[PDB]
Amino acid sequence: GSSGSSGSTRFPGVAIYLVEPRMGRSRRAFLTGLARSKGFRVLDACSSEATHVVMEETSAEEAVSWQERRMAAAPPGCTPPALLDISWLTESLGAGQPVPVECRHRLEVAGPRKGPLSPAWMPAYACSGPSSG
């Protein structure tokens, strides 16, 4: 409380890493330092240690695209880091501790859709049929 020393992050097992083309060179620092103060280890360069990746304004699928690059320059057996959004981080910082990842956080896709967007629905006066009695 009074002193100001540091050696081993509170949660070393969890290493959060941000993206340049996703966070920026200036902004990155903002969180980079903020987290460190809370109790999170920020990695400068993409390293196997990286367990969680922080992406801002990234689509569930988009994240994956950037994840591929890892497996490309990553060693065998090494498990890929869980791609999450800024929401997760923010919630963590405000909590002082790394919250447990959740579906919403996980950034993944599957069986995507295609085509334009339109209602193509029917109005109220779009019902008919015979009757008796």
Curated annotation (Swiss-Prot):
> Which residues are listed as membrane-spanning?
none
Molecular function, one GO term: DNA binding
Keywords, alphabetical:
DNA damage, DNA recombination, DNA repair, DNA-directed DNA polymerase, Magnesium, Metal-binding, Nucleotidyltransferase, Nucleus, Phosphoprotein, Transferase
Cell location:
Nucleus
| KW Methyltransferase (keyword) present | no
Q: What's any GO biological process attached to this entry?
A: B cell differentiation
Where in the numbering of this chain does the BRCT domain appear?
8-106
Which GO CC terms are listed, alphabetically? nucleoplasm; nucleus
On whether Transferase is a keyword of this UniProt record, the answer is yes
Q: Which family does it belong to?
A: Belongs to the DNA polymerase type-X family.
- Task performed by this protein: Gap-filling polymerase involved in repair of DNA double-strand breaks by non-homologous end joining (NHEJ). Participates in immunoglobulin (Ig) light chain gene rearrangement in V(D)J recombination.
Question: What is noted besides the main data?
Answer: DPOLM has a reduced ability to distinguish dNTP and rNTP as substrates, and elongates them on DNA primer strand with a similar efficiency. It is able to polymerize nucleotides on RNA primer strands.
Name assigned to this protein: DNA-directed DNA/RNA polymerase mu
Tell me what organism the protein belongs to: Homo sapiens (Human)
